[PDB]
Amino acid sequence: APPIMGSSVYITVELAIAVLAILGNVLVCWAVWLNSNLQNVTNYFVVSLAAADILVGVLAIPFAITISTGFCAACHGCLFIACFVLVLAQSSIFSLLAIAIDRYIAIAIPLRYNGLVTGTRAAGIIAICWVLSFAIGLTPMLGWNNCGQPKEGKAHSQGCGEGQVACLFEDVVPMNYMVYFNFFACVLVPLLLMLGVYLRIFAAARRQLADLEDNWETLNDNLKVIEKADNAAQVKDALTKMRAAALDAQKAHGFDILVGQIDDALKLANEGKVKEAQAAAEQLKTTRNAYIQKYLERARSTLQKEVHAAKSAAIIAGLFALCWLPLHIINCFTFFCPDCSHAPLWLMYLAIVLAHTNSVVNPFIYAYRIREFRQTFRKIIR
């Protein structure tokens, strides 16, 4: 029963989280700094996210411990302590959304990617996102707060001085802000947009892969057609099919040998020399073994690497949602069901701890899923 015992557990757990969030995310920043292979726009958003998680350990967690005491404070000071974590969560959402878009450009418009997506533009986007996060997270300080309706019975019972309140989250931060503005508009909508981006990434990868396969099968089918010695009409028609595919494959080294060899055979076939056109087409089986098989396999593995990277990013976004959703959902109960008894205090604190735990997990996901990070972590730890 004595409040200090339960508080001791919660504070201890918070501090353990803070240590881990600081240490793992410092390692992330260190790895990007040290390894030029990791210096790319995608990972500038990774660093912005790690910076947000570092600040969860250095500031948000000390603020959360502080506000759990209900200490007397000027209400607007209390608001800052209460809301600063919403800045960090918002910055995390922007960084996650940026990463998802980045991976979409990369898989969907790779020709243009490095042209569109530069480190200087990325740095500007990150600055903007941080500014917007401050404005979203600290909106209660602009007047959308309960500071005009203080709980004077709590204030008095705690001994607070004139004009102070007991600094408690749900006393000062309006739930309509938390539910409608923060959760629905600022969190859930970005998360649904993120989900839509990832679904478009995986559909674009699957489509490009199937086209690689279709274009390859077309080459091989049209060859068997030619060997089914029909008319010059046939050979011609199969070679035209092959040439088109060959450009879809190229347009999308030895493609010149390939298209030349097709053109050579097309001339023979357009001149009614079926057997020499057939003989001419058989040289294709060699250019295909020596060049086109190789281009296909490399294109396949480049794709898979990008699917792999996109899944890693999606995992991080999904873990952000898992960790933060319980708090938002509880707030919905508090707001929408005044007839419901309030979620109990142990559960509130469990949900807070769970949200903070999100700031620990990304460095593990990078180490398990991204060899360049893992390898750089290892060398740093030495």
Ligand X SMILES: CC(C)CCC[C@@H](C)[C@H]1CC[C@H]2[C@@H]3CC=C4C[C@@H](O)CC[C@]4(C)[C@H]3CC[C@]12C
Residues lying near ligand X in the complex (CB under 6 A) are found at 73-74, 77-78, 80-81, 322, 325-326, 329-330, 333, 340-341, 343, 347
169 contributes a contact to ligand ZMA by CB under 6 A: yes
65 contributes a contact to ligand OLA by CB under 6 A: yes
Least distance in angstroms from the C-beta of 177 to ligand OLA: 20
Give the residue among 378, 382, 376, 265 at the shortest CA–CA distance from 33.
376
Comparison of 92 and 287: residue with beta carbon closer to ligand ZMA: 92
- Total residues contacting ligand OLA by CB under 6 A comes to 16
By a kind-dependent CB cut-off of 5 to 8 A, residue 330 interacts, out of Na ion, ligand OLA, ligand X, none, with ligand X
Give the residue among 211, 198, 189 at the shortest CA–CA distance from 136.
189
By a kind-dependent CB cut-off of 5 to 8 A, residue 68 interacts, out of ligand X, Na ion, ligand OLA, none, with none
276 contributes a contact to ligand ZMA by CB under 6 A: no
7 contributes a contact to ligand OLA by CB under 6 A: no
Of 344-373, which residues contact ligand ZMA (CB under 6 A)?
Answer: 345, 348, 352
Q: Which stretch binds ligand OLA (CB under 6 A): 65-73, 177-185, 216-224, 355-363?
A: 65-73
Least distance in angstroms from the C-beta of 333 to ligand X: 4
Of 48, 218, 222, 357, the one binding ligand OLA (CB under 6 A) is 48
- Total residues contacting ligand ZMA by CB under 6 A comes to 11
Comparison of 38 and 86: residue with beta carbon closer to ligand ZMA: 86
Least distance in angstroms from the C-beta of 358 to Na ion: 6
Q: Which stretch binds ligand ZMA (CB under 6 A): 19-27, 167-175, 252-260, 282-290?
A: 167-175
The 3-class secondary structure across the chain, one letter per residue, is: CCHHHHHHHHHHHHHHHHHHHHHHHHHHHHHHHHCHHHCCHHHHHHHHHHHHHHHHHHHHHHHHHHHCCCCEEEHHHHHHHHHHHHHHHHHHHHHHHHHHHHHHHHHHCHHHHHHHCCHHHHHHHHHHHHHHHHHHHCHHHHCCCCCCCCCHHHHHHHCCCCCEEECCHHHHCCHHHHHHHHHHHHHHHHHHHHHHHHHHHHHHHHHHHHHHHHHHHHHHHHHHHHHCCCCHHHHHHHHHHHHHHHHHHHHCCCHHHHHHHHHHHHHHHHCCCHHHHHHHHHCHHHHHHHHHHHHHHHHHHHHHHHHHHHHHHHHHHHHHHHHHHHHHHHHHHHHHCCCCCCCCHHHHHHHHHHHHHHHHHHHHHHHHHCHHHHHHHHHHHC
Least distance in angstroms from the C-beta of 345 to ligand ZMA: 6
48 contributes a contact to Na ion by CB under 5 A: no
Least distance in angstroms from the C-beta of 51 to ligand OLA: 4
* Footprint of ligand OLA (CB under 6 A): 44, 47-48, 51, 58-59, 62, 65-66, 69, 71, 73-74, 77, 126, 130
Q: Residues in the site for ligand ZMA, rule: CB under 6 A?
A: 86, 168-170, 178, 327-328, 331, 345, 348, 352
